[model samples]
Every structure is written in C-alpha cells, then in structure tokens.
Target: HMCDAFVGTWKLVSSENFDDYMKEVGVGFATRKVAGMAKPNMIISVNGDVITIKSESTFKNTEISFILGQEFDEVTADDRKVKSTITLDGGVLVHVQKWDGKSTTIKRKREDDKLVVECVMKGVTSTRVYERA
Candidate 1:
C-alpha cells in the first residue's frame, strides 16, 4: 500500500484547534492541558500486514499495531478503552475509535513531504502537522 510512504519518524511542527478536539473527545482539563504542550513524535513502522504507530512524547507515550479493517481494543491518550480500527480510504489512513456510543475519526496522509493528521469528533476538527525526522 501507499502506507510505505508514511513509514518514518515525524515530529510535530504545528497543531490547530487540537484543544477543542480533545475536549470533544472528553479529555479532562488536566490531560488536555498537558497535551497542549506535548508535541509527540509519530513513528510509523510496518511489517507484512501489521502497521505500528507510536506516539512518543516527553509526558507520555502510547503505541498501537493493527491490521487494516481489523477491530481491536485500544486505550486512548486520555485513558479510555475503546474499539479501534485502522483502514485506508482513497489512500488516506483512517483510524476510528469508538467508546460508549461516542466515536472519532482520525485521518493521516502525506502531503508536501510532511505528515498531516486531521482529527474529528462530533463535528469538532483539529489539524496537526508533522515534519519528517
């Protein structure tokens, strides 16, 4: 898949409206506060059918390895256990997480030699930009 283009280390360079997006996802004040300053490095690795994405940050780190279209349990950054799936649509990497009837879709793609992440929850959207490391 085109996912090969995303297999690398990317450092966060900018983010827009992420606070509101995290709020929409129900992250508490303290966690969102911490997240605002936590610019994590996103490391994407792939092997055969499984892809691993690791969020490496100074405050906290989390990683997930999943196959396309398969459902699995994932503990979110705010610490909520949810059903998570990763798939590709129009060559865009889409990650969806559902919990307690609430869900969010995160789309990742490469553009201009950078990785762009768009997070959406309940109509609130955030864009995070990353530069290859």
Candidate 2:
C-alpha cells in the first residue's frame, strides 16, 4: 500500500521557494534564516489507523500524529495552533491545515525513491526534496 511505502526515514536534499512560503506563513526573519539552513530529517511511522510524522533538525524537533481523514489540533513548526487533516489519495499523502479561516496544504509523494514535499500557502508554493536514508 502507499501508506506502507511511507514508513521510513528521509533526509532533506534540496528545497525550492521555501523562504517565500515561510514568509507567507508569518515566520520571523531570524527564525526563517535558521530554518533555511536547518537540514531536517523526517521519520514516518504508521500503526493501524494512526500516522506519526517526526521532523528533526538542529533548531527544533516536532512530531505530529493523526488519523487519516480525521481532524486534529496541531501546533505548527511556526508555533501556530491550527486544525489539520491528513488524507491519502492514490500515491500521495495530502495534509491540510486551517487557522483563522486561512488554509495551507502540504502534499507528500514518493518518486523514484525520493520523497517530494509540496507546501502551499495562499497562492505561493514551495517544493522540498528528500531522499531515503
């Protein structure tokens, strides 16, 4: 299954337009600077109906867990409290976060052994590439 394919660790390779997305998401300048240089490692785990995504870096480490298609409260990396949902469609994992009537979408997919993460906020978007490690 697609979910089974997601259960592994990935190392950040390259990121494009991440600065713009961070700015749109209201990240502070200093934090954005540090975040831009923070090489993160992601670990994904799935147990039955629950999924946990852990992001680890020098600046911060965060873990978010949720059930597919079910809404859950989340504190984003930027420290914002929001409601989020995870849905699996075909070979992609789609995550939607909503706060203050605004929304952000993050899509995760695997391509040729690489993990592709697309982050969208408002109309701006960023693409991050990761390789299995």
Q: What are the runs in model 2 whose C-alpha is more than 4 Å off?
A: none
Worst 10 residues of 2 by lDDT: 1-10
Candidate 1 stretches with Cα past 4 Å from truth are none
Please, what are the lDDT tens digits per residue for candidate 2 over residues 76-125? Answer: 87888999999998879999999998899999998988999999998999
lDDT of each: 0.93, 0.92
lDDT score, candidate 2, position 15: 97
Sequence-dependent TM-score of model 1:
0.97
Best by TM-score: 1
Clash count, one per candidate: 0, 0
TM for candidate 2 is 0.96
Q: Which candidate leads the pack in lDDT? A: 1
Return the lDDT, model 2, position 128: 99
Give me the displacement of residue 100 in model 1, in angstroms: 0.4
Please give the lDDT score for candidate 2.
Answer: 0.92
- For candidate 1, the lDDT comes to 0.93
TM-scores of the models, in the order given: 0.97, 0.96
